[PDB]
Symmetry: C3
Subunit: 133 residues, 3 copies
């Protein structure tokens, strides 16, 4: 069909970074665009086209079972490969990420109606708290 | 007129880069902030003000008709000036963007309810697939 | 408790930059990630977990009363500390931000249903106009 009309949500994006590298794009905007997804609204009347490309950040998925070792590529962060294992310590989810970095992992627990997540590596700890919606 | 209450959506942003350069802001976040739009929710009680400044990415717009060469400032990416021409090859939209980069263009076609877009430059092609929502 | 099911919206992010630096993450993606907040939807059936981490830009909140000088940490821009004061010039909000940069401030006013904001540092002025929604 010749009809490109409608709203299109991206599902795949292969060699986007290589394409941008060939375009002589700069490290900053290459790192910006590599963490996105796009939706194109095309309005097409015969041979007249009006396109609008909206971009937002691509969700990151992590699926695991407690006690089962899995392979995690932290595309969210440093894009490293680690072997991750999660355990129950009382009501605490303790995850160890074995790999190049020492003392790397996180701990997650809930107090009241708020969630507490401590991400750790080398000596740097990061404390984040989330509210339930 | 002293009443700033409400949600205000941006329509213009002139010399934002120059303002940030005068603030001597760094290339990374300058490249991030130049691709944004802002919406300010103001709650104003007399002389008391409560600000919310939300930031969103900039919708990239492209309007063209098949067969007429047009001028494209390829923002979103390398911010280059190209002379672009799109043609129908059967049911495929093939556009070549003549400019500094050689063999630069793209192809667009439809299979069922999926859109296929191949962006090309030198030897690097990037394949993207979109689902209709 | 051991039930992490639901949607959790972030309200703090402490030592994120040190954590990312320890991960040997790059200035570009560190500068982007410091300008974000996250919302995680967790689906947990017993010991099976399915997490989805959505990313959205941060919200720059600014609270002031007209005539009272306040302290502003411009995390949106140069991450500088300035002592800011807002005054009425007719129906225009004129704010001076005393600090390292000279002649730094802004002006805000309403014409009809549009908002006009002029950000003024050294020699560079930046004009932004918003439409009321």
């Amino acid at each position: 069909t010749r009809d490109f009309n409608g709203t299109w949500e991206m599902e795949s994006n292969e060699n986007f970074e290589g394409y941008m590298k060939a375009l002589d794009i700069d490290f900053a905007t290459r790192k910006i665009a590599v963490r996105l997804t796009f939706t194109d609204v095309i309005d097409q009347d015969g041979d007249n086209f009006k396109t609008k490309a909206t971009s937002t950040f691509l969700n990151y998925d992590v699926d695991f079972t407690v006690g089962v070792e899995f392979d995690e590529y932290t595309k969210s962060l440093d894009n490293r490969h680690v072997k991750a294992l999660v355990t129950w310590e009382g009501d605490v989810l303790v995850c160890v990420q074995k790999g190049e970095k020492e003392n790397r992992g996180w701990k997650k627990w809930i107090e009241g109606d708020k969630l507490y997540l401590e991400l750790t590596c080398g000596d740097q700890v990061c404390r984040q708290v989330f509210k339930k919606k």
